Structures are given as structure tokens and as C-alpha cells.
Amino acid sequence: VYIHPFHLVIHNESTCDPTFIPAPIQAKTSPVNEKALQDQLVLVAAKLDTEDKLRAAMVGMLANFLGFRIYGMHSELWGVVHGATVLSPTAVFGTLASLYLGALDHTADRLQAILGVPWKDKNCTSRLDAHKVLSALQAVQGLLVAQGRADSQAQLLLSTVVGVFTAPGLHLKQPFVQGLALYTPVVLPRSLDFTELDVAAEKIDRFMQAVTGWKTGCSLMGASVDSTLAFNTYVHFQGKMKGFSLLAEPQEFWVDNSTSVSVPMLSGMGTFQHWSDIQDNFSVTQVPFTESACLLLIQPHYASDLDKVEGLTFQQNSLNWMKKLSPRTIHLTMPQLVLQGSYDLQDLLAQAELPAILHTELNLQKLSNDRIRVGEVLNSIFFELEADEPEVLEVTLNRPFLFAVYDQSATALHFLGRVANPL
Template identity: 70%
Template structure:
């Protein structure tokens, strides 16, 4: 590992250690000082508190009848530019936010997987998109809602005043940096191995006036922010149809999401994330292959296969194995395969937890022929439901103080995260870690033809961009 990466991780560990400092210490250094307001910023905020109440507002325009899809390659290039301009402190801040997003992502993934396990379907969750959505609400919140959101994001306020409060702009900027770090080494223009695009749809009642600073701040998280007005009260189903049709036109991909509209809603916040990863050195096998959903049921799916030297580890005690497939120098796909299909939930509980990185240290190079399903997974989940299951049902409820979003009382409807996750072949080159057929030990044959888990990890930011379960490659999350 490069010295810079070692320094980065060491700094993150130090920051975590500082979190344990006793509140009574005579000299106090806030463990998340990279993410909170500085003393000078606090002084400026105190001077502008009165002006904040007079922030300029605007009324979002109605949804247009026609629109063109976003240029995803242009969005990728924007993220590359963001990553290229990062200073050392920006990268440290990104690593800290990546760690916090991982913690919250693990927590919410468990909640989501418990809900969807009963249905036996796929699960796909983006910790960074989830964290960004909640950080966006933090940007628009006042106490006590802001304080509760800060705690959920993983940063205790400590009741130490302004200098222990999260700076929402720093958090959202770090999330944009995390996105940029993932795609920067994904390939040259027009040959991108990794694609990541984030779009936010902000839909309001026609009578609601939004504060300009809030909407402008969202651009720090999502390259595309679309505020539009929509009448929810007259015909919620028709409003939902119109909203979904608009977002399908913008993103260019079909939605499998709940309507997200109730008659008493005045604000809907929908985040759309598209990821496409091309596996270097992998080819699409001829014909369809069998994938065993359980011991007696199989489906026919396209499969990708590649031979090379990959990082691999088999945990004999807990009956699962892990394989790391590189997308680039810093980004990789982690595949977790239970040795027995019946152990899927047990392995899922072991794999996706806070000490996730500890067992990654057991990985070692192994000559392998790896076969994995080609994936096109669509997932949608309502953060309001996840918050309710996490015993926070009122966090974004009717009594939430969202005074930095609008001066009017806001009734937040469903808060949707929609994910399109694609895994495809990229057979222009051989696998990253071996340009030729592996020599030496016998090649290990690993075929993921039964339920497995996956994660997309980026080393420099320490961020897990996606966590997922594939129980059936043809199912919808």
C-alpha cells in the first residue's frame, strides 16, 4: 500500500480514537474537527443569524412536459475534475465521511435486509447515497432536528456549542469527493470502466417556497439537482405517475420504485444513483448458465468469466469465501460466497458489520478462474421506513424543524433512494493483476452460481459505495 494511503488510514484511526476523549478533559480536540465549524466560521455565523431568516426564496417551476436524459459521461468527467483538485485535507475529510457513511450504511443495510429477506429478493443499498440524503436534510434543518440528524450521522454534538456542530457543506463536499475518487481511475474518456451518476429530484407543493442557499448546497452532493413543483393533493396517483415519468426521462432508466406520494405531502426528496462497473479481463460466456436460487430451483442467467491472480480468502470456520476483483488501482468489487446456500443470512451478518475491514486483511493472491453473473439490479427503499424500523419514526415527521429549507411548515413524504447497479464484462484487456495465464499453483475454480453478497469499495476514501445481496440475479431489490 502506498505511504499516502497508510497516512490517511492512520489519521482516520486517530480521529476515531479521539472520539473516546472524556468530556471533562481540560484540553479538548473535537474528534471530527475536519467536519465541524471552525471558530472563525462560528463567529461569522453569529453575525449572519439575523440575515439567515431573510434568505432569498424561490418557487420551483412545474415539471416540464419534455426533457432530455442527463449526459452521464459528462457527469463522470465532472467528478474526475473534482478528484483531481483535492488537497490533502480534502482527502482526509473524505476518508472521515467515508467511515461515517460505512457505519450508517451497515446499520441501515441490516434493517433493509431483514425486511427483504422474507421476500427472498435481492438487496442493494448505497451507503454514500443514504448518508448524502440524510446530510442534505441536515443542511436544511434547525434544532432539535439538526441535532438529532447529526447524531444519526455519527457525530455527537457534545453540547459544546457551534464548534462541535457539523458543517453540512463540508460533509456534502466530502461526499462529492468520494464519488470522484471512485471514478477517477476508471478509464480514459469514452473508455470508462466505472460510471457513477447521482441525481436528486426535489418535488414540492406549488405553494411551497424553497430557500436558495439550501438548494444550491445540494449541488455539493449531487451533480444534478432538479427542484420542481407538483400538486399532490388533488390526485396523488396521477402526481406519482407524472413524477416517475419525468425522472425516467431524466435518468434514462426504468424505475421500480414506490409512488412516494401522499395527499398531505408538501416535499418529496428522491435520490437516484446509477453505477456501472466493467470487469477488466472478463468475457461474457456463450449462452445462459444455471444459477441456483435454492437447492431445487434454478434460473438461466448470463455469466461473466475471467482468469487471473485475485485476492482471495476462505473462512473455513464460518463457511464462506471472499474474492476481491480490482476495477482500478483503488476501487474494487468484493464478492462474498457462502459455502452453503442456507448460510446466506448468517454470512451476511458476519460480513457486513463495523469490523468489515479486519477480515479483508486475510486476503492473499491466488490464481483463479472466476465466474460471476452479469448483473442489472434495480433497488428502491424509503428512508422514512428505515428510520421507523430504526426507532426514529418522527425524525423527518410533521414536527421536524426544517427551517433552512423553507419558512413554511413542511410535511415530508417518502424519501426514496433508487439504485441501478450494473456489472458487465470489459474484455479489452487482461485482469489487472495478471496480464497472462497464471503460472505455478493449480488454478482455483470459483463460480458464483448460488446466492452471494457483494460490495464496491474505494480504498483512498475508505468508502463502501454499494452493499448488496444477490439471491436471484433476475429479481428486483
């Protein structure tokens, strides 16, 4: 909520390395202490200026608009068929913004526009460009996993570990890595032999799953043999919902009117907010995480044509302005969600922005000392939903539906996805 003033007052213009080779992955790397991570992220969220909160909100919206921009594929987003159909606008923006660090003129000047630039509408060069955006995007994570008024364990978790797997003898630069440090604490650069893709792909999975502790939907898929860099962001979302329980008896679902599927469920009793648009036939309920964070469940009224309805769940300013806040007694009923999901940004973005071409272009430098030829720039998510033990509305999701977790404090939607069937 809700408006935005325009200030159209014309004025007289104004404004304002030690490289290192990473070790092999065979080296014993300790796993990520997830408690230690989130406890550091809440501190980052706590020790944060009122000006920084606006910046976190701003970088949030940029991530939102980039996600809506990316729907310019026109229902081909799920065409990037790896794991469950769900992408992270904030992770996408971040992974893209981190490549911006390693970018000179042209390449940086493209990502500037492609990422969503220029945050300030200018490039006077400072600690904000690349460094401000990254640490602002760190903030938005802490803003999600907050529980400000809650104090006690909010139960929602957001881990984001950025793998930066270079080729052998690739002396990647120091200040770039400190830039990545601003975006996420868990920055794991480690060398790998890409000449053998089969051997690299299997070991790259064995490393991450060992380090992280969650099964990612494959890795190094569709990567060329003649490559060096592999900038892969790995995210994991935990989302516990109080007043919910897992059912031993499956209710089952219909991916389409003919076929059926044996699948789990999560019964929900509570008075949530929900309002159904009768113009385009819509309906959306939620199950807030300290209000700050909110899981919005977009239900297609008829559920006949999702592709048309779901299109209005990536539609610019409308999805956010959907905020009447009309409370109602609702019996929530939805499938138990525990699915992975990979998608390569270079496959995810194309034509309108055509970064695939821009990625294999020479100009990087600030990251690349030697020759960089990226095999994949992957975003892998592990979305997980959990439970902690007179008149109503029986809102069941028996047929396919849409959803998206959104943060009010950072005005940013961390996840958006579709559910055809759990498998």
C-alpha cells in the same frame, strides 16, 4: 490498513433568504449529460487538498458505520422489497445529510446523531456542518471514479441525481439548494401536484426516466395523499470488468437446493486476491477497478445459511479489516447483474433512530418556508456490471451470494447487496 490511535490527553476545552417556486415537470428539461458529469467529478477529485482526502475518507467511514447501524433492522433491510436487494451506504448517508441542511435544533440535533455526528464532535456552526459533509461526499464519488494511474477511460461510472419535488406554491429556499449543489451537480427541484398520487407517481417516473435515461423501480410508492415534499436521490452505477465476457449460453442458478433459474453469466480469467476464513467458514474474491475501487464478492463457504454469514458482511470493523491481500489464480464465474432498486429511508430507518416520526415533525425551516410533510425520501439505485473483452480455483456463484463495491481512497463502500436470483 488498519490501526487507529487514541489520543486521551485532557485539555482545557477549545474550538472554532431569497425563496423560489420550482416550475412544473411538464417543462422541457434537457437530459443529464453523463460524460459531462463524470468529467466534472474527476476534476473535483483532482483539484482536492491532501486534507480533503482525509475528510473524504472520514465521511466515507461515517457512511460505512451508518450502513452497519442500519443492519440493526436484523435482516429486515430486504424487507423493504422494491427492486433488487442492494443499498448505497454513501447515498443513504448523503440523502440523510442533505435533509440535515433543512433542520433546526432538535431535528438537526437528531439527524446529527442518526446520520452519524458530529464529524468533528461539536457544532460550532460553520461551512463544514452540512456544507463540508456534502462537498466531502461529492469528493468520495470523484475518488471512486478516478483512474489516477490509469489515465485512460477507467470504465466505471457513478451518477447521482437528486430530485427534490415540492408541492404547488412551496417556496423552497435558495441557500439550501446551493448546499445540495455541493453534494451533487445534478440537483433537480421541480413542482408537482401531490393531491393526485396516481397522476403524480406516473409523471414522476416519466420525468426522471426522461431526464436520467435509466428505468428506476417505480416512484412515489407508499406516499401519503396529504404530502408536499419528495426528496428523492437517484444513483446509477456502471462497473466494467476487463478480462470478462457475456455468455450466449446460460449456466443457470439455484436460488435454493430444489428450484432452478435460467440466467446469464460472466466468465473471468485472472490472478486476483482472495482468502477464505475457516473460523466462520468464509470466502471472498475481488475484481479491482484501479485498486482504488474494488468489487468484493462475498461467497458463503457452505452457502446454506446466508442470513448468518451475510450478517458478518455488515459487521462493524470486521468487513473492512478483511484485507489479507493473498493473491491466487481464480476462474471467476458470476451472473450478469443489471438490476434496479428503490428503498425509502423512512422505511429503511426506524425504532432505533425512528426518523419516520422525526420526518413528519414540524422542524425543518432552512428548507421549508411553507408547511413540509414528506411523502417519501427515496434512494433508487441502478447497479450495472459489464465486460470489455498450470492451476486454478473454479469459483462459481451457483447459489445466492453477497457483494459490495468499496473505495480504498475514500475508505468508503458505495454499495452493499444480496443476490437471490436475477429477474
